[PDB]
């Protein structure tokens, strides 16, 4: 009678990052006591409630849509009046931190800005979005893009396709530092809650990708709490969470053996019994399998 | 015994299965003068992938491999791997590496590299799927770039963005490229589809891709959204008949706006004549009614 | 080789416009103001031609706006307005002004008409109200909320607002000397033009007063501006150097030739007179203000 | 002798002199098929007001007076006062009360009242300048309203907002109304104007007025911005010749963009052929050069 909780059957190479439109590259764990893990994309509860700036379309994370105008080697600056991701007009009064899909990290997003005018003429060129700029105010409804080309028409529909990071100094990319969605004017609000292991000996487990970089030595490391397919899956199923913690096992269908076990928390993140920064090597055909709802005081087997 | 289901998705919550973009609209058109045989976004209702179709929405018209050398004046040779990094085998029974573009034209995007020493580069790139150097079935294709800042023998990725044709007629979404060039003809193709009932036309999930120049409409039609590709692969529910009856319902008013056939090979038809968009309200969604037979007469739209 | 002389335009009272609303001036008025803080932001100009607050030159754009209309998330329909600059430029909150130029500088409900013209040339216009006390009145952040009786508005279409008068239900909701919160409750008012007051014994502010139309109720529509809009425009054009902090002006009758009274025009752009009590200042139809001389601020005005 | 000057104003700092709205653009057109004889915004270079032109920017197409009774289907009679509240004298040598509309159509606005007991009303109203009851020269006109909430015999003001025509052809900005209705013809008109040099057309200060319905472009052209009306009235500089030479200058580049004639009767001409906007940078302004004669040959635009 109770709708059962499930996970989609996917290997590591069949999963997508929920903070950027790229495939998942690996599984990774590291200590996070020094940091506040409060990303806003890829935030979903196990019973299907989206949080933060999270939405369903994989391609739309860190993308935007709106109208370009002239503002007040990447020298050309442009003002973007943002619409909603689905084309509907944007209202700053909605109780989200920023338009859905807005980047949730400090740095420069490298991508391509494109335009299609009513007379059917089109143009597209490389563009960057400085999420640390004082004119990055997507919650207010606008942001600034930088371009190398001057081939852009004002008052024309503009789209931005995210590709990767485009910071000059590698330290400009801080994946766990939220931008100021209202610039200097207001604080961030309506945020999805921060996450941390509530248990001795446990660390967060990440679905990790290495984003493309347009220059420099940036590793492009972007960790999401849960892949986008699970966001989409939990939203569809909305199965009741019987406890705060679902027990999950990573299994190898060839050998039939459990490689490790982990906690999948109701708030939408994973923990594992392991210490220290390290990748988690999995077989190509392995997948995560839901074992049972469990009490939060369950002790995971170490790695 | 596993029932067939559709995910509950709005028009604005669907992704094109032939390009990593959202669906913009629903469209119908007569198709007797075109061959509808795209190879991405090809799935049967019981969850079998066909053509070059794979699961990752970002990897459609993307590639992965190694770059070597020889106004987008700079030409580069790309030795293709599989999207999962494993080496591509031209002997497998697919038309080309999974996610290879299935239309003639120039795919506009960004090529990027990350070297073992951690140095990186990314610049605009075009993939001409009509060039004789476009032989992804043989394991290689060619890109053109405007920037010369690329390192040979380095891991290279391609992020698709849109179309980049100079002449608008270069983009032909219903003409498959030659996956092996002029060395041989295409093989292992997902079958072509057509309406097979009087007064019926295909129903398309339409996107308008970005265009880097010119007047190209960038129109790209797919047979089912990528989310249905992913959902049918997961569910693998047995197809009880050749045709599923599906209805589009407005949850605000409770009313059915139109009905359609969802065919086992993974495409939809409606009772409609003429090239036309299908205007649907923002909260509408497709509902699976039941399995029927091909002789069902749909209500005209 | 002399400096540019300071001048006033020659205008009677029935030839002047309010600088806080697009209406003519009805009368001159004086009133004690030690109770209140006089800090309006429209119609603020220095005598040497510097605009302050939200003051701009176009008389019709005071309390007007333009932007893109959006549906919100009896005047019972609510709409969101993404505000542009009055010239179609996107509004920059980083500019050192309290709010977009022309933004209303008082608490209450501005009554007017909102209109739209679509790219397909279709048009609409209907009555609308701007509640400057609503928590969604955040023009400094680039948006505000209008309310309408009609539902005939298209979202995501270019929209203008023409101000007409006040539209409060209860008369006490209109407080001309209370500034709105230009960012709502989210941050403080910034870059305000300074407050004004007579810093001389026996002196009170002199106002150019209009009675705005009202859409209902018993509101007197009284709106006092420090300086008429024609002087805002004139001082900006002339930018004559201010020799002292006080210019002595006299209201003269060209028929009789006699001086009716004298007043101080202060450099910050306001006027004082030697008078006490709330009272209108009756003037002849042909009378006008005449610049007499720069004076030291301790000059003593003749009473009345 | 007082020299002639223009105020230093940007295009976005000028007001229409025929309606209380900002100037939207500059515009030129051949005008041999129209009569350019507006009555608001009429001033000579030496400061003489003409037609129905007055100083208050908010009072153009406004009125003041006393209302009585006679889908905007409520009709009301307005006994007109002067804009300064003084009674209107039809005997004066003006075409109509100052500020009276100078085009055929329906002026859309808001009529408001304030009673001696301080009760107030305001609702949408229209002034049809083509109606037989539009006789402002005789001292009265007629409004229509949607609301019935109006008290007879009370002081009534009209605030113009834009046009309110149902058919778009009813708005004829170059057709003067009959200020006395059918009783007699218009009198005391400001003179009509026309270019008088080969290749020269009038240059208009153009606004696009709000429209309460339909597809009317709301285009309203004035010969001179209201600020120039106010400036020349203040200055009253002697017009040394019939024509002033004026140039449009960009301060961001120092370059002159075009030159024009400013004629003594208060209108401008340029060397241009066709109906066209005049694109100007945001910081440009008109600069008075000197007095010339009507035989000057402007450089083509
Ligand atoms: C993020 C971005 O838009 N980058 C641009 C930009 O990258 C070059 C500049 O960032 C430049 C600043 O000094 O540094 C270049 O690299 C140095 C490197 O830091 C040194 O350690 C040494 O190797 O000399 C290099 C000379 O370039 C940046 O070049 C980029 O990064 C390098 C690590 C390498 O991968 C190179 O191929 C990259 O181009 O400007 C370049 C154009 O010159 C690109 O437009 C890039 O996107
Ligand atoms: C696909 C691609 O890489 N396009 C480039 C390239 O586009 C320009 C060329 O296609 C060029 C050939 O002469 O024509 C330009 O547009 C003309 C158009 O053909 C005329 O009909 C008329 O409209 O003048 C236009 C001036 O550009 C192409 O420009 C691009 O397309 C236009 C329709 C317009 O949208 C413009 O903004 C575009 O840039 O070269 C340009 C660089 O100049 C771009 O690099 C573009 O990506
Ligand atoms: C500002 C606004 O939107 N006004 C509307 C609104 O006005 C009427 C309501 O505000 C109503 C609320 O009770 O009160 C009315 O006047 C009452 C008055 O309060 C009573 O003391 C008594 O005198 O009865 C009156 C009604 O006959 C408001 O009416 C308006 O104000 C009156 C003094 C008078 O001037 C009348 O003509 C006005 O309409 O709602 C009305 C709807 O009829 C209008 O839409 C008005 O603009
Ligand atoms: C000038 C005025 O008072 N206008 C009113 C009035 O306008 C509507 C009527 O004029 C009506 C006559 O049938 O036509 C409407 O628009 C049609 C349009 O003619 C058709 O071509 C098609 O587009 O369908 C439209 C449906 O409205 C007029 O509506 C107004 O003009 C339209 C172009 C559109 O912009 C609409 O939003 C406007 O309201 O009546 C309406 C109320 O019904 C208003 O009161 C308007 O001010």
Author numbering:
A (entry chain D): 223 to 294, 308 to 538
B (entry chain C), D (entry chain A): 224 to 293, 308 to 538
C (entry chain B): 222 to 294, 308 to 538
Q: What does the paper behind this entry write?
A:
The crystal structure of the TV24 P dimer-A-tetra complex was solved by Molecular Replacement (MR) and showed a clear electron density map (mFo-DFc) of the extra density of A-tetra at 2σ contour level. All four saccharide rings are modelled clearly, indicating the HBS at the conventional location like those of other GII NoVs, on the outmost surface of the viral capsid (Figure 3(D and E)). Besides, R452 forms Van der Waals interaction with the methyl group at position 6 of the Fuc ring. Particularly, Glc forms two direct H bonds to R452 and another one with a water molecule, stabilizing the TV24-A-tetra complex.
NoVs recognize specific glycan ligands as host attachment factors or receptors for infection. NoVs interact with HBGAs or other glycans through their capsid protrusions that are built by the dimeric protruding (P) domain of NoV capsid protein (VP1). Genogroup II (GII) noroviruses consist of human noroviruses (huNoVs) that generally bind histo-blood group antigens (HBGAs) as host factors and three porcine norovirus (porNoV) genotypes (GII.11/18/19) that form a genetic lineage lacking HBGA-binding ability.
